[PDB]
Write a protein that binds this ligand. Sequence first.
Ligand SMILES: Nc1ncnc2c1ncn2[C@@H]1O[C@H](COP(=O)(O)OP(=O)(O)OP(=O)(O)O)[C@@H](O)[C@H]1O
Ligand SMILES: Nc1ncnc2c1ncn2[C@@H]1O[C@H](COP(=O)(O)OP(=O)(O)OP(=O)(O)O)[C@@H](O)[C@H]1O
Ligand SMILES: *[C@@H]1O[C@H](CO)[C@@H](O[C@@H]2O[C@H](CO)[C@@H](O)[C@H](O)[C@H]2NC(C)=O)[C@H](O)[C@H]1NC(C)=O
Ligand SMILES: *[C@@H]1O[C@H](CO)[C@@H](O[C@@H]2O[C@H](CO)[C@@H](O)[C@H](O)[C@H]2NC(C)=O)[C@H](O)[C@H]1NC(C)=O
Ligand SMILES: *[C@@H]1O[C@H](CO)[C@@H](O)[C@H](O)[C@H]1NC(C)=O
Ligand SMILES: *[C@@H]1O[C@H](CO)[C@@H](O)[C@H](O)[C@H]1NC(C)=O
Lengths: 435, 431
Amino acid sequence: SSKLQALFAHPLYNVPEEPPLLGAEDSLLASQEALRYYRRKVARWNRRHKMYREQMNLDPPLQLRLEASWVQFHLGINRHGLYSRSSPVVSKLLQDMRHFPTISADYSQDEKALLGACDCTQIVKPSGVHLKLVLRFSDFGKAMFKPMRQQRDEETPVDFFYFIDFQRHNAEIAAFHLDRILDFRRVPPTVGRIVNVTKEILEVTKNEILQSVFFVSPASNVCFFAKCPYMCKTEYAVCGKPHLLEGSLSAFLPSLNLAPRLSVPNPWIRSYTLAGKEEWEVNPLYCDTVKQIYPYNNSQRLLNVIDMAIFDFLIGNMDRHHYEMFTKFGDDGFLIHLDNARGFGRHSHDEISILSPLSQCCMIKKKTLLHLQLLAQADYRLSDVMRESLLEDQLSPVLTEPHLLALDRRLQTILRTVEGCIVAHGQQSVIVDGP
Amino acid sequence: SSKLQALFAHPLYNVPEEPPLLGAEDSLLASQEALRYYRRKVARWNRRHKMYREQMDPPLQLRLEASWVQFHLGINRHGLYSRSSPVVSKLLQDMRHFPTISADYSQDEKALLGACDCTQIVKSGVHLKLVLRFSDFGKAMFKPMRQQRDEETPVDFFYFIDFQRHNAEIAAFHLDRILDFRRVPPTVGRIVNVTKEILEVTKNEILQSVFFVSPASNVCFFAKCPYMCKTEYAVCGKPHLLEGSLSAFLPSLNLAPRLSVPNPWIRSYTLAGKEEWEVNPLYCDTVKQIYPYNNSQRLLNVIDMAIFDFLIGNMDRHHYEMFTKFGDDGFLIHLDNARGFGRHSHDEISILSPLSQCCMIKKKTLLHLQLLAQADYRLSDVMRESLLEDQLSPVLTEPHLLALDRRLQTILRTVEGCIVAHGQQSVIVDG
Ligand SMILES: Nc1ncnc2c1ncn2[C@@H]1O[C@H](COP(=O)(O)OP(=O)(O)OP(=O)(O)O)[C@@H](O)[C@H]1O
Ligand SMILES: Nc1ncnc2c1ncn2[C@@H]1O[C@H](COP(=O)(O)OP(=O)(O)OP(=O)(O)O)[C@@H](O)[C@H]1O
Ligand SMILES: *[C@@H]1O[C@H](CO)[C@@H](O[C@@H]2O[C@H](CO)[C@@H](O)[C@H](O)[C@H]2NC(C)=O)[C@H](O)[C@H]1NC(C)=O
Ligand SMILES: *[C@@H]1O[C@H](CO)[C@@H](O[C@@H]2O[C@H](CO)[C@@H](O)[C@H](O)[C@H]2NC(C)=O)[C@H](O)[C@H]1NC(C)=O
Ligand SMILES: *[C@@H]1O[C@H](CO)[C@@H](O)[C@H](O)[C@H]1NC(C)=O
Ligand SMILES: *[C@@H]1O[C@H](CO)[C@@H](O)[C@H](O)[C@H]1NC(C)=O
């Protein structure tokens, strides 16, 4: 039969989560306050669209429809995660980002600043994906489009080979599918899409700078480039073949005006060579100190970081410098796992230093451990349910077989690490229950 | 006598460097082209200053004998400045004493205004730094001392806070000069009247509006977006004076373009047991076959940079910068050393990975390290002596100074390990 279907039909994936949702105070957005904010944005967008049409030389207006996928997605964000388990709203949102036509395109706000005044210090930073764009669909929803990395390192002399995000777009897609399978529900829905850069980007953008950077390749391909990255001799161009370009689309979170977010540094982003001969991943003194440092003094926050370390270890992401949280949900709120483009880069190496929070603190959520133990059994094998889940995406296969099988190998390392913690402290100390 | 004086009088610190400079192609700037560019900027600044003052004095003239002008014209293929340079000595004094005439935000921080997004704010970033311009038209990067405790910055993680930030920029330059790397810009400490020398001289209305008087009757200025993100957001005089670090500006990118290059050893990896990462050569054997590390000079320069970073315990050298004119094999600029001198009781040997994996080192670099390990030229003694010249003396406490001796011994013991495995001929490269 189907292992993915058996997984979500399993009793474990149908246990109600505690404490139950109390409606208002547990939802991220207030429906009436958020809807009138979106209605003002749609009226704003229609005014710009009517005036822009007059400035050039030339359809019915757009209406904010409450039943849109992204609207229900935003209103569905609650204290338990970004989305619900076995959610038909997420399924509809994935299809909508995959098929809906685009109506506008622009740069991301963080890259509109780096249009200068070209300085290679703020351009060659890691984890930064230049040439990415924000697309707006016909239902007014927005997604972050990260195009596939195409240029080899000979075309980018400054880039170091083993740091290039070759798997960049595949990593965003597969990280969401693993998030759903693990039932963390902490990364935004993400799909692959083959995009006509001419029709769905160049012909819909109102940004004159983005219009001017499009050009025709000597091989008769349609391309757009970033000028400042080109001068810094890093990645600067992507091209259709001759029009179609493959990439990843990630659904936008609610506006920071409606839901502010904080960025918090990851205390385990770096490992340290301790004075011999105790190993870093096994020594608990660091976490013993972090446990006494706000906000890691409360149980939920440290357990959430341990969840994030397990997720990062599974995808081999060494670049989680910071994690983000919603302000409304306070310190005990869940962590948002954004920008996973640095994952799934090395299928033949497992960086156990990512697991350091688990191996040092020696505690784990009961829910998290049961899901990992279930995904290690043959009937629910993690590589099988992942491969099956990823067949839904337009860019199937998202992950090759070596990456899928590495998920099973890294899962065994996580469970074998849990065994080590239990030997040293007992199940009562390691396996923490939820309020 | 004086160990610092004995160091620079030693024969080693007076050997002429090969190959000798051939004048034109070895200097960074073309004198006549750069001087007319600076003269246009001074005329521009006088034009901006004449209109601004009318909306509410004799003009400024670009003087060739100014310290920073000779500093810029002195940059050549061998480093940012010359050994035992009286121009550098004058520049350190000028940045310490000259009055300011203008103040503004750094260019990279004018972008984050803002439009507040905490992702681009909590990035090694000093958001309260300012660029000051002196009466001789020279510019310096002012990084104020970190004052706010972590209770006032709920998002900041304690062991990541750059408490030693301003002292680290100063001490990193003094160590750069003592090592004779000559690769970081001259840097001084200064106790700055934030009212007289910043608020009353800036033409940026936003910077004017962020100044306020503390309830404790201190003069402060703050950053709005960092405050909302619950990170470091304010520094204060007591009630006017605030100490910080001043780093001399490099020439304009219009005159001398620079590239940023990722450090291939910024991260360490857990190899399959039980071979250690810093000792296993397979990684550098691969990097040696990857441009531009296939040529000798570039890899040796990175190894120099790793030695420097290990001495100061800087784990945050994600990128290094180079001048475009000098092409490959050019020297590396060691900028923004604010993350150094943070842990005096811990030695992160993974920083030394380029040396311990590649097992090669410059002959010049090794001889300077071997000399600085001897009692008569002890690195901690010459550093402590050198740092007494700064207004914020001692700049470094005793644990940080003594850690320099311990890390120097670790570097030398690593070289011995390389020589045992490959012999002196393979490890010690000549120029
Ligand atoms: N799913 C996501 N993946 C990656 N980054 C995201 C995602 N959602 C939001 N962001 C980040 O948040 C920014 C959008 O923040 P903002 O609050 O401006 O949203 P907005 O809807 O554009 O705001 P406004 O309501 O003013 O138009 C993006 O530039 C991006 O960097
Ligand atoms: N000593 C230094 N330490 C650290 N960073 C520096 C130093 N000198 C220069 N920089 C960096 O290099 C950048 C150079 O900027 P820029 O090219 O605008 O210089 P400029 O002289 O202001 O140029 P312009 O001729 O346009 O005025 C600065 O923004 C600064 O961040
Ligand atoms: C992708 O989009 C482009 C642009 O709309 C399509 O190209 C055009 O349609 C036909 C086919 O060449 C021509 O008569 C038009 O003149 C083209 N327009 C432009 C602006 O070039 C293209 O067909 C789409 N599909 C693919 C697979 O490329
Ligand atoms: C720092 O600078 C301020 C401003 O120049 C000095 O304050 C002034 O002191 C004079 C008398 O010496 C008064 O006439 C002004 O009204 C003061 N201005 C303000 C804003 O208070 C201050 O004395 C300086 N502090 C030093 C040099 O330590
Ligand atoms: C965690 O520590 C903070 C310290 O400010 C305290 O306010 C909070 O009540 C503590 N919570 C728990 C669950 O220990
Ligand atoms: C290193 O490789 C580049 C390009 O592959 C080449 O131009 C250069 O000459 C090589 N280095 C040496 C020392 O030959």
